[PDB]
Amino acid sequence: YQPTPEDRFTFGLWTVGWQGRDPFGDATRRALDPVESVRRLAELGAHGVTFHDDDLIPFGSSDSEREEHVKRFRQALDDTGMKVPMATTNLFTHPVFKDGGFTANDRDVRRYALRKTIRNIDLAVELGAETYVAWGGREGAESGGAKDVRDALDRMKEAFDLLGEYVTSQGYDIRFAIEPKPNEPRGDILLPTVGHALAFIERLERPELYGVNPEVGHEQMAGLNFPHGIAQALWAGKLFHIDLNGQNGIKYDQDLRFGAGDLRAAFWLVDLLESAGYSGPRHFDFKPPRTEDFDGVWASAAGCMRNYLILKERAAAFRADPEVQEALRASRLDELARPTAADGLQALLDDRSAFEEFDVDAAAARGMAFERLDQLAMDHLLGAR
Amino acid sequence: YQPTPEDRFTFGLWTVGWQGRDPFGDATRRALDPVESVRRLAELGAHGVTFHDDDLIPFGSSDSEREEHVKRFRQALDDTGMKVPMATTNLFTHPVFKDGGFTANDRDVRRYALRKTIRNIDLAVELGAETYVAWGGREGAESGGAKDVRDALDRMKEAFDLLGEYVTSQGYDIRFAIEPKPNEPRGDILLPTVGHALAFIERLERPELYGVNPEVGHEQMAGLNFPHGIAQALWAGKLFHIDLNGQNGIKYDQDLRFGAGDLRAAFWLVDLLESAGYSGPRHFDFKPPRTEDFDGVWASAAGCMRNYLILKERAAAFRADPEVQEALRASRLDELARPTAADGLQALLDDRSAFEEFDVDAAAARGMAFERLDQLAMDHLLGAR
Amino acid sequence: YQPTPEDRFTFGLWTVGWQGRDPFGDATRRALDPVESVRRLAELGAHGVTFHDDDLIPFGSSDSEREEHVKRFRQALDDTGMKVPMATTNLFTHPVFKDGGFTANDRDVRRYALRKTIRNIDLAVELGAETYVAWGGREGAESGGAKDVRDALDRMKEAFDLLGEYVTSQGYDIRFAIEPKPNEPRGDILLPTVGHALAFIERLERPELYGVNPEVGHEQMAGLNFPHGIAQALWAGKLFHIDLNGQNGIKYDQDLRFGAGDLRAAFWLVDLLESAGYSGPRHFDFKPPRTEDFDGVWASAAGCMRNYLILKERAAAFRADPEVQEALRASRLDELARPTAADGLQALLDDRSAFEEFDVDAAAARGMAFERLDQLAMDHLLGAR
Amino acid sequence: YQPTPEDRFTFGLWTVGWQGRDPFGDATRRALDPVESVRRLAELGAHGVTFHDDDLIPFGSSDSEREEHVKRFRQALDDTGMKVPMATTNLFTHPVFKDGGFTANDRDVRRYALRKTIRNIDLAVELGAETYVAWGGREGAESGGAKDVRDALDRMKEAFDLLGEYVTSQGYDIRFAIEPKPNEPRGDILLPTVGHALAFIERLERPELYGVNPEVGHEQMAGLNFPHGIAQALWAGKLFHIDLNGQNGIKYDQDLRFGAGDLRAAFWLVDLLESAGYSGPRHFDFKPPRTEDFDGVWASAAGCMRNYLILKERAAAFRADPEVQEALRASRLDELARPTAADGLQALLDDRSAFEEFDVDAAAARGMAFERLDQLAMDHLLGAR
Ligand SMILES: [Mg+2]
Ligand SMILES: [Mg+2]
Ligand SMILES: [Mg+2]
Ligand SMILES: [Mg+2]
Ligand SMILES: [Mg+2]
Ligand SMILES: [Mg+2]
Ligand SMILES: [Mg+2]
Ligand SMILES: [Mg+2]
């Protein structure tokens, strides 16, 4: 189960670089130089890395310092063959963003947030990124009167429209991906789920430029089914990027390594991505627990990739098993894929077998055989066949 | 705090008529005749009632029995002045719907579900309903392989497109409202939140015909902020109807009377509906607890309306208080309503006060004054001013 | 992975016998004769069955009808070799119990609940049960003023004390097990978790007679770690019985087959029960989903036992792996088992290496190596070694 | 609604002193001198303050620096009349505690944790504290193999037994209170709820020395009913202290000001504390949101006390209303307080009115009248009577 760069596994600089500061504790690890992270991730078999502006260039850097930070980083990419497929903006750490960036109540903060974003879009394009992610972690509220949400959505649409005007006027070949999260660090965050983000995109001026960047743990913080939400994003043509990690139910954002948390949900996710032919990066947004030293950091990162590859093998074995293929027919998955009424509305209205002469009791007696099918999936996941 | 029919309070026949059967217990109340419910709700000051087909016409009724059930019902409406603003279809009780209606794996069940729906659309229009609600309570799954969600969404879109073709060909003046719910009775339900439903509507052939019917308790079963979701639905122009009740957190669907559950969320909801000028029915989808006899049924229904009227008074007093109006300016709600960059993208890029000369430390030091504002809201809710 | 009666797998009559009625739907399966269930479970390799009084003897049965129902049941046990290790009382289905049994506000209902329980204790002893379970599903409230919880706990203690007086005066060799549940069907249920039940037992007059009957899905409805709670019950010497099933997070009580839901938690549970030497029944309290016909009922029951046996093999392989044993030493699980201060309080106070000369920075730098250990557990669960 | 020191309102130094650093953001406020906090809280009408050792004496302070920090603090207490009723130990911030204090896998860390605690017990007694709180925020795990919970509970019992030996040998008049929390910052925390903590205390060598310090928001992070848990703690005689704040459901620990979050639960809590005659401190463990400047800090602290006093008035008015007193009799709260069987077991067995001649249908038909009672409580809370 050895990863190769062809598997397209990517990691944020902020993931293996997390120093372990949590709301009740100080850092347990020293800071990692971005160049060392790139080198160490390349040896593990990763394809590339991603970054926030402030991960790569310390906040408040002079233009001269900025140029040398980028130059060092580019040299590490050239030495290793790593790519940078995605970049994003930090609009959440600095105190100025305490009430948001794009939807801060203060207008001057909103204009600053846009300029900070635009400057990193230029850098991302220079480094070859294809996707630009926006996680509005500070957009939201702890109390009801603090934020008029209709006005906030007006401001959010205004910001993303301006960003789309900028990339189209510059001729950039980059697309945007909105990352939803239901809560934390704000009491409630705007666009809290995949669904809310997909709905918002359809009101932007150039919807074709925007998709979603869903994260396993974030949808699970609302108790939702992550594979179901990914299926709706794929159905809409909007899965531009994906963040993989693990989460144990409804609680604080744990960012466990992928495969931890809800293991069966991880299996059904990999089954779906591989069956659908998703061709984007398999990106890990995770935190090595602060109990770990640097050896544990790299073990946890390796485990992300290993677990994806194990689940990929088991899902493929499941779908290729002739006994599973007949169980899928026994449960009428083949009929689900067939149109309900390709004969049209009038023919349906005239069809007495659809109502007047439909035997509801005979249809109701037909078992779905879902439990046999699900035990075949369990046996395949566990390697018990 | 006396309701009048001008307040537009409506109730489902199935609400006060719930006999108290739950998954662990038998019914504690006898069945109510729809005619008696209409009479008793009119005396309490309700505006009208809503129904599922099977609430009004017992399943399996002959055409002759059907005509007399409707005739009796219409006479009660004429005697009381009650209206019927909304109707819906039962696609969840009968065993034939155990794997769904519109997205059942069996194609013949899906065609039956469409014919059952179309027949009740005709009845709804005859009784004057303006909105037709769809709650897909059986659309979903308990296990991952049972339902290919991309195929299921294809079938769901096919069903709603056929329904829109039917109403437009018949010249009906009725619109559809999709009611989301995250889970129960299926392990996960398709279109689980307001957001997912809004996103789905934008892929239908005639999106102008479809909106949402959100329910307080359902969004709270995913831990989401119900007033925030309503604000996004209003922003999109899609709040066609609303279901009011109460829910104590993430658990089974409690359907408590409105004002029970999360009281502060009820206050912010009423504030938003009244400020936005929502003019549709204030519909209660609630269950009088099975501890109650019929006197308790009518007390619980009266309490729904009373709590709405109390909260309406307190929210109005909050917004009209000059001290609250200056607190809103102190927290810069006025600036949130002003465009970020009406001067345009180029002017923003050329504005040195937006980045090069922006004083981030001075802006970061400005307090938001949100806690004073929220205590003014608490004082108004509690009548402590 | 074939079960034998030596594995001690047991099932409630109400599990495979569940007809599929849920709060929104009618039954999808016909009722099962208890004699047929006993026969079919014996062929699958079960050890025995459990029952509520009303599962075996329809409510309101004459003494003559009661005798023939028991006689038929006993003959099926004799023909198959099945045992009855546990019995319990239905104090939740009949409308008279709508506000509780032992803690109903009406005193005459509380006395009736005690007499109904005592009559089934006699039957349980006659059939050889060693454990008598109490699930107070109706003990609780939907509103704050309905139930004074201090008075309710007085009544709950009074009921269990009277039951302990009864069994000791009759010379019965049977013990009680309290089954906690946080909510459903009441809005909040008294003694909602394993912890609350353990604490309550220590205030009874004869605490040695009472332990807990925890259920996987119930602790997960509060978001708690089920293996951790089982460990505390074992530590206290109070794990008298256990209910095995599956649950997908915080929502309605799903009662999925064991191994579904949180698969990793099922692995750690089996590891703990087998390591600790738990010798009681492995009881399944689960519902075959109402999508299934009778073939699916028996497939789902077989899957309960199969999943336990697979996890038992993988946990045993994990603990016997020499590489796992050195990883446990690397993470200092051996030091956790050693007393902190067997030298005593005074020696600890005089030990300068414990404070004055303790090198906190060197200790803080030691990694715990927990992520390597957890990936070894994942590899063993998945059969990737 | 003006607080006086007779109301016994207390605040932790770490509450108003929280600088606003969260897991995704830097501090938004400068650090407060403990002496200034004492002065400002005294002017607001607080009774006293509480502290962790490291709040008052920076970690790593020399004995000489330690003496001057305490001397300054004592002078502020003398100048203002503020008391110190509670103190606690920081066993969670420093990296050395990353795997726990009392239950760390490393034995030398566990011995250090005990010595750090004992040194602050001496200081607490010197400053007059009556209660010593222990919050084991780092005791727990993110993965199943990292922590054998039976061994961890052995170590936890060993630590608390040693602490009880220390206070009894020194002749101190101080008692311990264990503060439960279900999760955060560890993935699962040991003793996660009030119930688990009460059960654990009964296995200590001197149980009379230990009680609980429950926190509103912590029990709500498991979806539990906080007034119900407080009632069980009072019933057991173990409510030694209480932490008041607000929480919006199952998510990260919000620590909102008291009265925010679940407002109805706050009403029922105040009703219970006042009815039961709880005479300990009303302690606020809350965080002014990081959106606020120092004016907002003091507004949020004032709001804690104001909301308690408003709810106290409304609960008193509820219980004194003659119409509420007859509604309580209508719902048979008076019968709940009467023994079920003071006549004894034999008389109950001989009572034919309890079973043979009990009319279950007549009893089942009696409504509980709980909804009328709950609307009277709502009207009183809202000042609508
Ligand atoms: Mg995350
Ligand atoms: Mg992410
Ligand atoms: Mg509902
Ligand atoms: Mg509804
Ligand atoms: Mg259950
Ligand atoms: Mg059970
Ligand atoms: Mg807290
Ligand atoms: Mg606390």
- DSSP labels, C120-159: HHHHHHHTT-SEEEE--TT-EESSGGG--HHHHHHHHHHH
Judge: C192–D195 Cβ closer than 8 Å, yes or no. Answer: yes
The size of the B-D interface in CB pairs under 8 A is: 120
Q: Which residues pair with D22 in a beta bridge?
A: D25
Contact C296, C255 (CB under 8 A): no
* CA–CA distances in Å: residue A171 to residues A131, A175, A206: 15, 12, 14
Amino acid making up residue C118: I
* CA pair distance D227, D249, nearest whole angstrom: 15
Q: Which residues pair with A256 in a beta bridge?
A: A246
With 0-12 / 13-18 / 19 or more C-beta atoms within 10 angstroms meaning exposed / middle / buried, residue B342 is exposed
Contact A31, A17 (CB under 8 A): yes
* CA pair distance C103, D183, nearest whole angstrom: 32
The size of the A-D interface in CB pairs under 8 A is: 102
List the one residue out of C195, C196, C99 whose CA is nearest residue C138: C99
Judge: D348–C114 Cβ closer than 8 Å, yes or no. Answer: yes
List the one residue out of B194, B205, B193, B271 whose CA is nearest residue B238: B194
Kindly state the tokens that stand for D63: 């004995």
Strand pairing category for C86-88 and C48-52: parallel
* CA pair distance C327, C370, nearest whole angstrom: 9
Q: Which of C354, C361, C370 sits opposite D146 (nearest CB)?
A: C370
Kindly state the tokens that stand for B363: 């802006």
List the one residue out of C5, C9, C36, C53 whose CA is nearest residue C308: C9
CB of A145 less than 8 A from some CB of D? no
Provide the residues around ligand 8 (an ion) whose CB is within 5 A: D 215, 243, 285
CB of C17 less than 8 A from some CB of A? no
Kindly state the tokens that stand for A169: 């006027």
Q: How far is the CA of B248 from the centre of ligand 3 (A)?
A: 12
* CA pair distance C280, C353, nearest whole angstrom: 46
Kindly state the tokens that stand for B1: 């705090």
Contact A269, A216 (CB under 8 A): yes
* CA pair distance A244, A270, nearest whole angstrom: 10
* CA–CA distances in Å: residue D18 to residues D37, D142, D221, D235: 11, 26, 21, 35
Distance between terminal CA atoms of chain D? 19
* CA pair distance B264, B285, nearest whole angstrom: 19
Chain C hits for A331, Cβ within 8 Å:
none
Contact C223, C193 (CB under 8 A): no
* CA pair distance D90, D117, nearest whole angstrom: 8
Q: Which of A146, A185, A250 sits opposite D22 (nearest CB)?
A: A185
Interface test with D, best of B224, B312, B368, B382 (most D CBs within 10 A): B382
List the one residue out of C215, B267, B375 whose CA is nearest residue B385: B375
* CA pair distance B88, B215, nearest whole angstrom: 15
* CA pair distance B215, D156, nearest whole angstrom: 46
Cβ partners under 8 Å of residue A111, min gap 6: B340, B341, B348, B351, B354
Chains that touch C (3 or more CB pairs under 8 A): A, B, D
* CA pair distance C279, D8, nearest whole angstrom: 52
Chain D hits for A260, Cβ within 8 Å:
143
Q: Return the ∠ at Cα C34 (arms to C99 and C57), rounded to 5°.
A: 45
List the one residue out of C222, C320, C292, C230 whose CA is nearest residue C266: C230
Cβ partners under 8 Å of residue D373, min gap 6: C143, C145, C146, D324, D327, D328, D330, D331
In this structure, is the dihedral angle defined by the CA atoms of residues A237, A238, A242 and A247, taken in order, positive or negative? negative
Contact A139, A190 (CB under 8 A): yes
Alpha helices in chain B (DSSP H): 13-16, 34-43, 53-56, 63-80, 107-126, 149-170, 194-201, 216-220, 226-235, 263-276, 294-320, 322-330, 333-336, 345-350, 360-365, 370-381
- B196 annotated as ligand-binding: no
Stretch (H or E) spanning B88: strand B86-88
* CA pair distance B91, A337, nearest whole angstrom: 21
Residues 192-251 of C with CB under 8 A from B: 221, 248, 250-251
Contact A98, A148 (CB under 8 A): no
Q: Which residues pair with A93 in a beta bridge?
A: none
Contact D222, C222 (CB under 8 A): yes
* CA pair distance C333, C337, nearest whole angstrom: 7
Read off the DSSP letter of residue A50.
E
Chain B hits for C248, Cβ within 8 Å:
187-188
Kindly state the tokens that stand for D161: 């037994």
Q: How far is the CA of C243 from the centre of ligand 6 (A)?
A: 5
- D74 CA to centre of own chain: 26
* CA pair distance D368, B303, nearest whole angstrom: 16
With 0-12 / 13-18 / 19 or more C-beta atoms within 10 angstroms meaning exposed / middle / buried, residue D216 is buried
Read off the DSSP letter of residue D142.
S
Judge: A199–B203 Cβ closer than 8 Å, yes or no. Answer: no
Q: Which of C292, C302, C364 sits opposite A367 (nearest CB)?
A: C292
List the one residue out of A102, A94, A77, A249 whose CA is nearest residue A163: A102
Cα atoms in the Cβ-side hemisphere of radius 13 Å centred on B102: 26
> In angstroms, what separates the C-alpha of C263 from chain A's closest C-alpha?
7
List the one residue out of D8, D4, D85, D5 whose CA is nearest residue D278: D8
Active site residue A78: no
Catalytic site residue from C47, C53, C54, C55: C55
Contact B163, B176 (CB under 8 A): yes
Judge: D25–A98 Cβ closer than 8 Å, yes or no. Answer: yes
Judge: D185–A142 Cβ closer than 8 Å, yes or no. Answer: no
Judge: A223–B221 Cβ closer than 8 Å, yes or no. Answer: yes
- DSSP state string for A153-183: HHHHHHHHHHHHHHHHHHT---EEEE---SS
Judge: B296–D263 Cβ closer than 8 Å, yes or no. Answer: no
Contact D206, D172 (CB under 8 A): no
Read off the DSSP letter of residue D209.
G
Read off the DSSP letter of residue C354.
G
* CA pair distance A333, B270, nearest whole angstrom: 44
* CA–CA distances in Å: residue A258 to residues A225, A292, A303: 16, 17, 8
Strands of D259-336 (E only): list them. 282-284
* CA pair distance B209, D53, nearest whole angstrom: 64
Helix, strand and coil percent figures for chain A, each rounded to 5 = 50, 10, 40
HEC-encoded secondary structure of B52-81: EHHHHCCCCCCHHHHHHHHHHHHHHHHHHC
* CA pair distance D13, A130, nearest whole angstrom: 49
Active site residue A379: no
Kindly state the tokens that stand for D352: 């034919």
* CA pair distance C357, D100, nearest whole angstrom: 20
* CA–CA distances in Å: residue A225 to residues A219, A266, A376, D5: 7, 11, 21, 51
Cβ partners under 8 Å of residue D157, min gap 6: D200, D203, D204
> In angstroms, what separates the C-alpha of C302 from chain A's closest C-alpha?
10
CB of A70 less than 8 A from some CB of B? no
Residue C197: closest CA among chain D residues belongs to which residue?
Answer: D195
Q: How far is the CA of A185 from the centre of ligand 2 (A)?
A: 13
Amino acid making up residue D229: G
* CA pair distance D20, B368, nearest whole angstrom: 14
Amino acid making up residue A108: D
Read off the DSSP letter of residue C236.
T
Contact B173, B129 (CB under 8 A): no
Q: How far is the CA of A265 from the centre of ligand 4 (A)?
A: 29
Residue whose pair of structure tokens reads 């046999």 in the numeric block:
A372
Interface test with C, best of B14, B28, B251, B293 (most C CBs within 10 A): B251
Contact A238, A273 (CB under 8 A): no
CB of D372 less than 8 A from some CB of B? yes
